[PDB]
Amino acid sequence: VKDSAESLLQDLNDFNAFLKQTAKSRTENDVHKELVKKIKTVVNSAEDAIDKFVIEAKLVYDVAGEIKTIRDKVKEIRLNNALDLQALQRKPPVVEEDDVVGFEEEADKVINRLLGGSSGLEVVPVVGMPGLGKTTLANKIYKHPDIGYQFFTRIWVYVSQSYRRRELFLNIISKFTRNTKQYHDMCEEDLADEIEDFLGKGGKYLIVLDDVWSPDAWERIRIAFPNNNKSNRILLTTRDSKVAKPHDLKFLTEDESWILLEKKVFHELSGKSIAKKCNGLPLAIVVIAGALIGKGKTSREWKQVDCNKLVQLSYDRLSYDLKACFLYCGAFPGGFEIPAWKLIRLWIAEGFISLECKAEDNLNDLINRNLVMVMQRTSDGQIKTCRLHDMLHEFCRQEAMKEENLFQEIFPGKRELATYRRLCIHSSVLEFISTKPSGEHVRSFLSFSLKKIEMPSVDIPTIPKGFPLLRVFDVESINFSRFSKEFFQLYHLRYIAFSSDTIKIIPKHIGELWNIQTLIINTQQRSLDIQANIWNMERLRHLHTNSSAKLPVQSLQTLSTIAPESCTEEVFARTPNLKKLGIRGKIAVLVKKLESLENLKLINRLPPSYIFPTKLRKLSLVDTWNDMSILGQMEHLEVLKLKENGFMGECWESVGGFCSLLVLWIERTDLVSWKASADHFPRLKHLVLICCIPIGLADIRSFQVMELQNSTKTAAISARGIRDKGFKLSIF
Amino acid sequence: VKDSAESLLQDLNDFNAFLKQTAKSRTENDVHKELVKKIKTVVNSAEDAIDKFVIEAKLVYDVAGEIKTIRDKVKEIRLNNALDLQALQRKPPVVEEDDVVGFEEEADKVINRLLGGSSGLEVVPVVGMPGLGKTTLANKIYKHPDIGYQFFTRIWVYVSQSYRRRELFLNIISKFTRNTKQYHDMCEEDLADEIEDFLGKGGKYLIVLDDVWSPDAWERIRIAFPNNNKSNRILLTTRDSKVAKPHDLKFLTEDESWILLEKKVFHELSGKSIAKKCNGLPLAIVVIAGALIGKGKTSREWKQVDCNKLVQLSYDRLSYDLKACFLYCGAFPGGFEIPAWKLIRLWIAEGFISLECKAEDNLNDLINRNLVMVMQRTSDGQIKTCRLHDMLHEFCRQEAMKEENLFQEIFPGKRELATYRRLCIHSSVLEFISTKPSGEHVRSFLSFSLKKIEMPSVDIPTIPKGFPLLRVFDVESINFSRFSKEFFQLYHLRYIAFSSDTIKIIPKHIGELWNIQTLIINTQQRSLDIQANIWNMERLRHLHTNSSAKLPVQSLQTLSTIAPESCTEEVFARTPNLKKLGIRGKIAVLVKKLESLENLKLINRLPPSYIFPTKLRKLSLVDTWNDMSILGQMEHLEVLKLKENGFMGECWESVGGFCSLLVLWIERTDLVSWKASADHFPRLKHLVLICCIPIGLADIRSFQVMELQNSTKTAAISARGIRDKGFKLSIF
Ligand SMILES: Nc1ncnc2c1ncn2[C@@H]1O[C@H](COP(=O)(O)OP(=O)(O)OP(=O)(O)O)[C@@H](O)[C@H]1O
Ligand SMILES: Nc1ncnc2c1ncn2[C@@H]1O[C@H](COP(=O)(O)OP(=O)(O)OP(=O)(O)O)[C@@H](O)[C@H]1O
């Protein structure tokens, strides 16, 4: 059976290489698409069989039969479709010029940015979502009367993914001379020099480089534009934020969306609801208006209404792994606030992806390409939450549900569920669960709902029974009263995330699951006792709990909210690579050996400063004023968060030197008198005071962002005075 | 089984020919890459099976089974992937013009070289590493105000690997006339004559020939440039040193590297450490700055950071054997000082490559292409040590570890080690050894560490056990207390290099290994007794020991530090091809028959000069003044090194005539009075005096390099006076 496993592994590797090769091009051939789907199904079957054999080897007849039948299927596919297997390995946009809604103020903003500045060649980059309207705004600015009056020469160059520098340079030359047959033998650099002479002969010039996709194209084309100490400007529209390094183009409002839809259809509650569902994207409004123009003007045909090639331009530029990472963001429901940490852990568990660094790099790559929107950011600048735009969400859902079978949103029949690979259900979870589903190839069970669900006791073991091959089990919105004997049979589990109301103890049978990477226990009990062999899990990396978990007496990276009785030297000696640590166990009971620790959280007198780790970067104290001199000696502390009565006192005088502090966060304190000088916070950048101000922080060079919340008006006056003395101040 | 061995040899030969053919082109097809990897794996398996059969034949059932299964695998591969097997058989650079750091002095140097010289057409060649900045410096010089003022005509020609002479000539012509349609029927020689007329009509001309790759291109393009007795100049940038036969472009300093990185990212300790790790290569700085511009400006995302197509241009021009020789240099750790002799012997033993002459030619070819950097050179001009640049080291490591599986740096599992071919481990050697690794296909075990390691006795036979197919065993950084019975079972050994502290005797069972080529015994004992049948090793070529080895009573080329009791006529009659010989055995105890000897070393009254070999070229005496008249009669001696009290005396008067001496090396002597004239050293070029001067050596025509070290200031004054009377003098 082992040699059969090796042969099946070789077949699966060749099929995976074929799938990776065919993903480089989109095929419209239906036979090729069907063959690709068949090959993907066989690949999934082979993966499941190999994982089953691996689990049995770690711990057989049915496994052998499955391996034989999958090998036979592979041979049949190779023999039958050999020829198909071998065969499977410029229009500038027309934008609106007459009825442009909402861009009247953004156009003036960009124009005033173009008409003002230094005397050098400056660039005004416009970045935005696919179909946001960057070309429309660039055209409105390009044909504006003020721009035409100020700029003697205006040139519109349409760059794209595919362009020829010689063709572009000869197109630019034709705007100045008609005898372009004299350049048939000059090189592209001589063409650029000729363009430089042409542009320098006149006055100021404005150049619109539309749809720049890489900095390489920008550098190659820029050699034709002189910098002759005149206020020459370049207007650049791009999807990627890297090419702009800007002006982030706005979204249309609800009223503007309705205005655009009404103008496009008619040169109504149903119409207003249709325009509201486009989320301020003019491309969606245009597409839906083109669809509505063909239907009759009847309220019943507009209630039935309640593109794809433009998005594919940026989706086809993603790598093979980044495409699967991007499509997995469509599993989260529409408008959902995706937690970045949860998304990263899910990506690592699904096998798409230190691994955390690569996953954060993938998320930042998706954000830079404007495929993912950021809303919440951490105080230190990291991303906290994100979401997909509704058109991007629809694209991801359609692609991953139809063409890739990455996941299926849920009722499917017994024949349909046998082909599903991942399940995402957030509505009518109990109704689907009561049907007793059974999927032998389902690898993930996702349930992202913000409403808590209590799982009936009679239905407790249905998911571990019907889906025994689960690798990801994210049911943190479902309360599990108890664990059945079938949960411990999920030997393939890598990501487990459950919520509970009465689970005060983790059984030792959890340690029988040696594939666990992330163990998230969201319980409302005050204390939790983890009896499972945490240290015997060789693949465990993160352990998140919201209670005071008590660990039993290398790859581990996070130990969130453990009890201080579990802060022994023996326990900390088993986790040399720990980076984030939290304690929520009556701090008064009590980490030096953790030389890689960066995040520390204590939730409820400070010891000498030499006891705390010297490499700590972020420290947060919750429910625990002159004691801050101990935290001042921390030479590497950069973020300090005080939440929920973290530091209580009346008078605080700044004495210690926070040589590395960048963010100071104080929440729910009784501080009355605070005296400080610029010397005590040399590197301060971020200051947040919520539900709580010496004028010495205006002398700080790095102080640029200050956040204020509800408090006495004297604090608001002090903040306003500090702002008067770019600074960002917000008071609420 | 013999006929099966012949059939498998034929199959392996065909597969090797296929692998050699596909290496001529880089394939981006993933299916093709997987097929190439599979074919390489099968080739390795066939090679191991054939060598096992050869060893058994020299000295069976398992060998037959392995041969049958490998033949079946070959047939299956041939039948399955026949179509894939059959299918498997211009952008000038844009460089920085505004922010160029560090080149302000190099540009002035090259400019003063261009503006000064004779009245003929001179060339200023700029040679350097891939990405060093030759094009940037050439562009800075080309657009310099002084160059523009002095040279009326300046032409920038971009040569590359692929160029068309007609296209280049028509591009040059277009710089002088716009009616280039009159040249549609002239030959390229008439085009060159027209260019000659155009360039001779004006004044002086400067021409920048960028990226010249072969002297043939230089000769073909040079026919268009007249030599009209004006100070016409050509600026040439190339990677190969042969095309320049120059100006070796400098590397950016650490401060300059940080300046460039800061300028590129921001138009920090982490930033300084990132710029320091680029090793002064502006291409690496540019790439890392482009990478950093996409990440957020947070200290945590800059600590996570702690191209390839440019290097591939020079790597793809290497031959099939030179590519493997080059990638093997990446086995040595980063920044390691690779000994040239050890590298050559390793290349010969690995089968990449008299053989020593070819290996030295390969090393010099790699050096000329600027793929390998030379730091230490022998006193006679030969190369002693070398290293790889860190970008080249990374390229070699990545290529040989991912795409070729040439070697793997080390923990890998039992399934992963079954595919490894060579192992390089220099950190945590004992930890990996204690895991008891077992690789049935591992052919080399490399450990290049400068820190000595004592090998536990319980772990002594682990390497000969887990790796029974070893061909190269370089563990000279590991001390072996004793030899286990498994060491003598390594019948495939070709290169054995071990260190020891108490091994005073080599067992006779070493002679059972008849495949040994290099036998390096690095022991700290004063004397060593080699009982193995050295003369029975028909393939032994080099025998290096640091102790007084006592040999027992044709291919041999080196016998380093043997005892003079082993300098008998009988022993020397068995080695007619010996070229290097050393003796470290109390020289007072005592080679004429060695008619091919070149190097002789005696380590502790001279006999008549007719006793010493007449062919001797280099002689070194260690611990052994009027006796130098005996060495003077040596008509072919060119290098004479005196180290560690080699020649002791008070007064030395030069009498003998060193008609062929080129290098004189004196170290740690008590010489007080030295009298000499130009007649006694007619051919002297190199003079080194360390830890020890008549003015008669200034009359020597060939005296150009003099090296001095710590001594009395009178010697420094004499050296300075000699320099006053190009000469290279260094005093420390
Ligand atoms: N403010 C607007 N008013 C009216 N129509 C608009 C407006 N903005 C965009 N459109 C229209 O919606 C579509 C959006 O395409 P457009 O070229 O403006 O987008 P883009 O930002 O350049 O996107 P892409 O990245 O795909 O090039 C076009 O048909 C355009 O005419
Ligand atoms: N001194 C410098 N200051 C700033 N940027 C530099 C400097 N030297 C090189 N660069 C930049 O680094 C890269 C090096 O490429 P460059 O063309 O200068 O190298 P090269 O010596 O011609 O190499 P190749 O053999 O690959 O052609 C370019 O992007 C160039 O702009």
PDB file of N, CA, C and O in Angstrom, chain A residues 10 14 17 20-21 24 78 86 89 182 184-187 189-190 194 220 242 245 360-361 368 380 638, chain B residues 28-30 34 38 80 83-84 91-92 94 170-171 174-175 178 180-181 290 293-295 298-300 304:
ATOM      1  N   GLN A  10       2.993  10.638  -6.927  1.00  0.00           N
ATOM      2  CA  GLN A  10       3.597  11.085  -8.180  1.00  0.00           C
ATOM      3  C   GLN A  10       2.531  11.528  -9.178  1.00  0.00           C
ATOM      4  O   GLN A  10       2.670  12.577  -9.827  1.00  0.00           O
ATOM      5  N   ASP A  14       2.064  15.352 -10.739  1.00  0.00           N
ATOM      6  CA  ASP A  14       1.970  15.705 -12.156  1.00  0.00           C
ATOM      7  C   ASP A  14       0.663  16.430 -12.464  1.00  0.00           C
ATOM      8  O   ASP A  14       0.650  17.408 -13.222  1.00  0.00           O
ATOM      9  N   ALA A  17       0.903  19.967 -11.193  1.00  0.00           N
ATOM     10  CA  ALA A  17       1.706  20.769 -12.110  1.00  0.00           C
ATOM     11  C   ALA A  17       0.901  21.160 -13.343  1.00  0.00           C
ATOM     12  O   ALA A  17       0.987  22.301 -13.815  1.00  0.00           O
ATOM     13  N   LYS A  20      -1.503  23.900 -12.330  1.00  0.00           N
ATOM     14  CA  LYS A  20      -0.788  25.161 -12.180  1.00  0.00           C
ATOM     15  C   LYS A  20      -0.449  25.767 -13.537  1.00  0.00           C
ATOM     16  O   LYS A  20      -0.489  26.991 -13.704  1.00  0.00           O
ATOM     17  N   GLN A  21      -0.114  24.925 -14.518  1.00  0.00           N
ATOM     18  CA  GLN A  21       0.235  25.441 -15.838  1.00  0.00           C
ATOM     19  C   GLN A  21      -0.982  26.013 -16.559  1.00  0.00           C
ATOM     20  O   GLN A  21      -0.901  27.085 -17.167  1.00  0.00           O
ATOM     21  N   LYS A  24      -2.440  29.661 -15.940  1.00  0.00           N
ATOM     22  CA  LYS A  24      -1.795  30.840 -16.503  1.00  0.00           C
ATOM     23  C   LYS A  24      -2.581  31.454 -17.651  1.00  0.00           C
ATOM     24  O   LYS A  24      -2.267  32.575 -18.064  1.00  0.00           O
ATOM     25  N   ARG A  78      -5.494  10.080 -18.341  1.00  0.00           N
ATOM     26  CA  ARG A  78      -4.295  10.302 -19.144  1.00  0.00           C
ATOM     27  C   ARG A  78      -4.431   9.679 -20.527  1.00  0.00           C
ATOM     28  O   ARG A  78      -4.006  10.271 -21.527  1.00  0.00           O
ATOM     29  N   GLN A  86      -2.366  17.926 -23.960  1.00  0.00           N
ATOM     30  CA  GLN A  86      -1.276  18.615 -24.642  1.00  0.00           C
ATOM     31  C   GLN A  86      -1.705  19.997 -25.118  1.00  0.00           C
ATOM     32  O   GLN A  86      -0.910  20.944 -25.091  1.00  0.00           O
ATOM     33  N   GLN A  89      -1.795  23.113 -22.252  1.00  0.00           N
ATOM     34  CA  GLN A  89      -0.620  23.726 -21.644  1.00  0.00           C
ATOM     35  C   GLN A  89      -0.258  25.029 -22.348  1.00  0.00           C
ATOM     36  O   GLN A  89       0.779  25.629 -22.069  1.00  0.00           O
ATOM     37  N   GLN A 182      10.480  59.831 -41.172  1.00  0.00           N
ATOM     38  CA  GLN A 182      11.892  60.100 -40.937  1.00  0.00           C
ATOM     39  C   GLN A 182      12.431  59.389 -39.705  1.00  0.00           C
ATOM     40  O   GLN A 182      13.639  59.453 -39.451  1.00  0.00           O
ATOM     41  N   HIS A 184      11.988  56.016 -39.113  1.00  0.00           N
ATOM     42  CA  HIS A 184      11.851  54.579 -39.315  1.00  0.00           C
ATOM     43  C   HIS A 184      13.092  53.817 -38.872  1.00  0.00           C
ATOM     44  O   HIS A 184      13.012  52.605 -38.645  1.00  0.00           O
ATOM     45  N   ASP A 185      14.230  54.498 -38.740  1.00  0.00           N
ATOM     46  CA  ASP A 185      15.477  53.851 -38.366  1.00  0.00           C
ATOM     47  C   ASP A 185      16.040  54.326 -37.036  1.00  0.00           C
ATOM     48  O   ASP A 185      17.029  53.751 -36.568  1.00  0.00           O
ATOM     49  N   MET A 186      15.455  55.347 -36.417  1.00  0.00           N
ATOM     50  CA  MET A 186      15.925  55.793 -35.115  1.00  0.00           C
ATOM     51  C   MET A 186      15.510  54.807 -34.030  1.00  0.00           C
ATOM     52  O   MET A 186      14.464  54.157 -34.115  1.00  0.00           O
ATOM     53  N   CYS A 187      16.344  54.702 -33.002  1.00  0.00           N
ATOM     54  CA  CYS A 187      16.045  53.840 -31.872  1.00  0.00           C
ATOM     55  C   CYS A 187      15.020  54.502 -30.955  1.00  0.00           C
ATOM     56  O   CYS A 187      14.712  55.690 -31.075  1.00  0.00           O
ATOM     57  N   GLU A 189      15.314  55.277 -27.899  1.00  0.00           N
ATOM     58  CA  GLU A 189      15.916  56.347 -27.110  1.00  0.00           C
ATOM     59  C   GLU A 189      16.015  57.636 -27.919  1.00  0.00           C
ATOM     60  O   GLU A 189      15.806  58.731 -27.383  1.00  0.00           O
ATOM     61  N   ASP A 190      16.320  57.526 -29.212  1.00  0.00           N
ATOM     62  CA  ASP A 190      16.313  58.707 -30.067  1.00  0.00           C
ATOM     63  C   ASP A 190      14.900  59.254 -30.232  1.00  0.00           C
ATOM     64  O   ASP A 190      14.703  60.473 -30.306  1.00  0.00           O
ATOM     65  N   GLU A 194      13.691  62.966 -29.215  1.00  0.00           N
ATOM     66  CA  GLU A 194      12.893  63.821 -30.089  1.00  0.00           C
ATOM     67  C   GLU A 194      11.643  64.319 -29.376  1.00  0.00           C
ATOM     68  O   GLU A 194      11.261  65.487 -29.514  1.00  0.00           O
ATOM     69  N   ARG A 220      10.139  53.218 -17.937  1.00  0.00           N
ATOM     70  CA  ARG A 220      10.503  53.134 -19.350  1.00  0.00           C
ATOM     71  C   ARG A 220       9.886  54.273 -20.153  1.00  0.00           C
ATOM     72  O   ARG A 220      10.528  54.817 -21.058  1.00  0.00           O
ATOM     73  N   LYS A 242       1.397  50.652  -5.508  1.00  0.00           N
ATOM     74  CA  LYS A 242       2.851  50.704  -5.624  1.00  0.00           C
ATOM     75  C   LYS A 242       3.298  51.625  -6.752  1.00  0.00           C
ATOM     76  O   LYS A 242       4.320  52.309  -6.623  1.00  0.00           O
ATOM     77  N   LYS A 245       3.764  55.327  -5.825  1.00  0.00           N
ATOM     78  CA  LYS A 245       4.776  55.700  -4.844  1.00  0.00           C
ATOM     79  C   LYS A 245       6.169  55.717  -5.462  1.00  0.00           C
ATOM     80  O   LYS A 245       6.416  56.418  -6.444  1.00  0.00           O
ATOM     81  N   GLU A 360       0.650  37.735   5.920  1.00  0.00           N
ATOM     82  CA  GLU A 360       0.476  39.184   5.996  1.00  0.00           C
ATOM     83  C   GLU A 360       0.981  39.862   4.729  1.00  0.00           C
ATOM     84  O   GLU A 360       0.404  40.858   4.277  1.00  0.00           O
ATOM     85  N   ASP A 361       2.057  39.336   4.140  1.00  0.00           N
ATOM     86  CA  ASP A 361       2.528  39.862   2.864  1.00  0.00           C
ATOM     87  C   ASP A 361       1.484  39.664   1.772  1.00  0.00           C
ATOM     88  O   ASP A 361       1.273  40.549   0.939  1.00  0.00           O
ATOM     89  N   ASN A 368      -2.716  46.375  -1.698  1.00  0.00           N
ATOM     90  CA  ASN A 368      -2.023  47.316  -2.573  1.00  0.00           C
ATOM     91  C   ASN A 368      -2.626  47.317  -3.971  1.00  0.00           C
ATOM     92  O   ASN A 368      -2.710  48.366  -4.619  1.00  0.00           O
ATOM     93  N   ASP A 380      -0.514  50.664  16.037  1.00  0.00           N
ATOM     94  CA  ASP A 380       0.860  50.729  15.562  1.00  0.00           C
ATOM     95  C   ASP A 380       0.965  50.723  14.040  1.00  0.00           C
ATOM     96  O   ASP A 380       2.080  50.667  13.510  1.00  0.00           O
ATOM     97  N   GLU A 638       7.363  50.267  22.284  1.00  0.00           N
ATOM     98  CA  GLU A 638       6.870  51.210  21.293  1.00  0.00           C
ATOM     99  C   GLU A 638       5.378  51.485  21.394  1.00  0.00           C
ATOM    100  O   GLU A 638       4.947  52.586  21.046  1.00  0.00           O
TER     101      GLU A 638
ATOM    102  N   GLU B  28       9.530  27.626 -18.829  1.00  0.00           N
ATOM    103  CA  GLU B  28       8.579  28.106 -17.836  1.00  0.00           C
ATOM    104  C   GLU B  28       7.374  27.186 -17.683  1.00  0.00           C
ATOM    105  O   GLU B  28       6.524  27.442 -16.825  1.00  0.00           O
ATOM    106  N   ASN B  29       7.281  26.132 -18.489  1.00  0.00           N
ATOM    107  CA  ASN B  29       6.168  25.198 -18.398  1.00  0.00           C
ATOM    108  C   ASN B  29       6.328  24.331 -17.155  1.00  0.00           C
ATOM    109  O   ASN B  29       7.353  23.663 -16.986  1.00  0.00           O
ATOM    110  N   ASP B  30       5.312  24.335 -16.288  1.00  0.00           N
ATOM    111  CA  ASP B  30       5.394  23.575 -15.042  1.00  0.00           C
ATOM    112  C   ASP B  30       5.396  22.073 -15.292  1.00  0.00           C
ATOM    113  O   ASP B  30       6.078  21.329 -14.578  1.00  0.00           O
ATOM    114  N   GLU B  34       8.343  19.568 -14.066  1.00  0.00           N
ATOM    115  CA  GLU B  34       8.102  18.346 -13.306  1.00  0.00           C
ATOM    116  C   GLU B  34       8.676  17.130 -14.021  1.00  0.00           C
ATOM    117  O   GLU B  34       9.253  16.238 -13.385  1.00  0.00           O
ATOM    118  N   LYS B  38      11.558  14.603 -12.622  1.00  0.00           N
ATOM    119  CA  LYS B  38      11.380  13.155 -12.587  1.00  0.00           C
ATOM    120  C   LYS B  38      12.510  12.442 -13.322  1.00  0.00           C
ATOM    121  O   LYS B  38      13.032  11.422 -12.849  1.00  0.00           O
ATOM    122  N   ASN B  80       4.916   7.161 -21.322  1.00  0.00           N
ATOM    123  CA  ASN B  80       3.864   8.066 -20.863  1.00  0.00           C
ATOM    124  C   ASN B  80       4.044   9.467 -21.444  1.00  0.00           C
ATOM    125  O   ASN B  80       3.092  10.061 -21.964  1.00  0.00           O
ATOM    126  N   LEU B  83       5.289  12.869 -25.911  1.00  0.00           N
ATOM    127  CA  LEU B  83       5.039  14.182 -26.500  1.00  0.00           C
ATOM    128  C   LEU B  83       5.759  15.286 -25.737  1.00  0.00           C
ATOM    129  O   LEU B  83       6.328  16.196 -26.349  1.00  0.00           O
ATOM    130  N   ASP B  84       5.749  15.222 -24.404  1.00  0.00           N
ATOM    131  CA  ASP B  84       6.477  16.206 -23.609  1.00  0.00           C
ATOM    132  C   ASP B  84       7.980  16.087 -23.826  1.00  0.00           C
ATOM    133  O   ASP B  84       8.692  17.098 -23.858  1.00  0.00           O
ATOM    134  N   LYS B  91      15.451  45.303 -25.050  1.00  0.00           N
ATOM    135  CA  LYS B  91      15.054  46.331 -24.088  1.00  0.00           C
ATOM    136  C   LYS B  91      16.300  46.934 -23.454  1.00  0.00           C
ATOM    137  O   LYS B  91      16.841  46.368 -22.488  1.00  0.00           O
ATOM    138  N   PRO B  92      16.793  48.057 -23.972  1.00  0.00           N
ATOM    139  CA  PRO B  92      17.946  48.701 -23.349  1.00  0.00           C
ATOM    140  C   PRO B  92      17.630  49.091 -21.920  1.00  0.00           C
ATOM    141  O   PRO B  92      16.488  49.467 -21.596  1.00  0.00           O
ATOM    142  N   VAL B  94      17.177  50.928 -18.309  1.00  0.00           N
ATOM    143  CA  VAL B  94      16.860  52.251 -17.787  1.00  0.00           C
ATOM    144  C   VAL B  94      17.548  52.377 -16.436  1.00  0.00           C
ATOM    145  O   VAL B  94      17.223  51.644 -15.495  1.00  0.00           O
ATOM    146  N   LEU B 170      22.382  51.391 -38.872  1.00  0.00           N
ATOM    147  CA  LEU B 170      21.334  52.310 -39.300  1.00  0.00           C
ATOM    148  C   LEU B 170      20.872  53.202 -38.156  1.00  0.00           C
ATOM    149  O   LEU B 170      20.433  54.333 -38.394  1.00  0.00           O
ATOM    150  N   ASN B 171      20.956  52.718 -36.915  1.00  0.00           N
ATOM    151  CA  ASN B 171      20.665  53.571 -35.768  1.00  0.00           C
ATOM    152  C   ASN B 171      21.722  54.655 -35.609  1.00  0.00           C
ATOM    153  O   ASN B 171      21.397  55.804 -35.291  1.00  0.00           O
ATOM    154  N   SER B 174      21.221  57.327 -38.358  1.00  0.00           N
ATOM    155  CA  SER B 174      20.091  58.221 -38.126  1.00  0.00           C
ATOM    156  C   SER B 174      20.454  59.403 -37.238  1.00  0.00           C
ATOM    157  O   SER B 174      19.746  60.415 -37.253  1.00  0.00           O
ATOM    158  N   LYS B 175      21.535  59.299 -36.465  1.00  0.00           N
ATOM    159  CA  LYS B 175      21.999  60.420 -35.659  1.00  0.00           C
ATOM    160  C   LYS B 175      22.658  61.509 -36.492  1.00  0.00           C
ATOM    161  O   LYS B 175      22.902  62.601 -35.967  1.00  0.00           O
ATOM    162  N   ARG B 178      18.587  62.171 -41.730  1.00  0.00           N
ATOM    163  CA  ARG B 178      17.217  61.697 -41.605  1.00  0.00           C
ATOM    164  C   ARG B 178      16.743  60.912 -42.818  1.00  0.00           C
ATOM    165  O   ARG B 178      15.754  60.179 -42.715  1.00  0.00           O
ATOM    166  N   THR B 180      17.391  58.033 -44.318  1.00  0.00           N
ATOM    167  CA  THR B 180      18.020  56.730 -44.181  1.00  0.00           C
ATOM    168  C   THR B 180      17.480  55.724 -45.182  1.00  0.00           C
ATOM    169  O   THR B 180      17.884  54.557 -45.147  1.00  0.00           O
ATOM    170  N   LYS B 181      16.583  56.148 -46.071  1.00  0.00           N
ATOM    171  CA  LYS B 181      16.046  55.268 -47.095  1.00  0.00           C
ATOM    172  C   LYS B 181      16.991  55.131 -48.283  1.00  0.00           C
ATOM    173  O   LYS B 181      16.769  54.274 -49.141  1.00  0.00           O
ATOM    174  N   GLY B 290      12.612  48.577  -3.676  1.00  0.00           N
ATOM    175  CA  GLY B 290      11.323  48.352  -4.310  1.00  0.00           C
ATOM    176  C   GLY B 290      10.432  47.443  -3.485  1.00  0.00           C
ATOM    177  O   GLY B 290       9.216  47.633  -3.427  1.00  0.00           O
ATOM    178  N   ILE B 293       9.234  49.574  -0.358  1.00  0.00           N
ATOM    179  CA  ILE B 293       8.298  50.657  -0.628  1.00  0.00           C
ATOM    180  C   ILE B 293       6.848  50.193  -0.535  1.00  0.00           C
ATOM    181  O   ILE B 293       5.956  51.015  -0.299  1.00  0.00           O
ATOM    182  N   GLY B 294       6.589  48.898  -0.705  1.00  0.00           N
ATOM    183  CA  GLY B 294       5.235  48.389  -0.625  1.00  0.00           C
ATOM    184  C   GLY B 294       4.779  48.096   0.787  1.00  0.00           C
ATOM    185  O   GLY B 294       3.576  48.074   1.065  1.00  0.00           O
ATOM    186  N   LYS B 295       5.727  47.870   1.690  1.00  0.00           N
ATOM    187  CA  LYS B 295       5.397  47.575   3.074  1.00  0.00           C
ATOM    188  C   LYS B 295       5.164  48.862   3.858  1.00  0.00           C
ATOM    189  O   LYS B 295       5.640  49.942   3.498  1.00  0.00           O
ATOM    190  N   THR B 298       6.560  50.616   9.414  1.00  0.00           N
ATOM    191  CA  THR B 298       6.531  50.157  10.794  1.00  0.00           C
ATOM    192  C   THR B 298       7.784  49.343  11.077  1.00  0.00           C
ATOM    193  O   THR B 298       8.231  48.563  10.233  1.00  0.00           O
ATOM    194  N   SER B 299       8.349  49.533  12.272  1.00  0.00           N
ATOM    195  CA  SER B 299       9.586  48.846  12.627  1.00  0.00           C
ATOM    196  C   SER B 299       9.419  47.333  12.673  1.00  0.00           C
ATOM    197  O   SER B 299      10.405  46.608  12.501  1.00  0.00           O
ATOM    198  N   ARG B 300       8.201  46.838  12.897  1.00  0.00           N
ATOM    199  CA  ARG B 300       7.984  45.396  12.904  1.00  0.00           C
ATOM    200  C   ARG B 300       7.981  44.812  11.498  1.00  0.00           C
ATOM    201  O   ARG B 300       8.403  43.665  11.310  1.00  0.00           O
ATOM    202  N   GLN B 304      10.997  42.214   9.702  1.00  0.00           N
ATOM    203  CA  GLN B 304      10.659  40.995   8.977  1.00  0.00           C
ATOM    204  C   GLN B 304      11.465  40.857   7.696  1.00  0.00           C
ATOM    205  O   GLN B 304      11.652  39.734   7.214  1.00  0.00           O
TER     206      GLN B 304
END
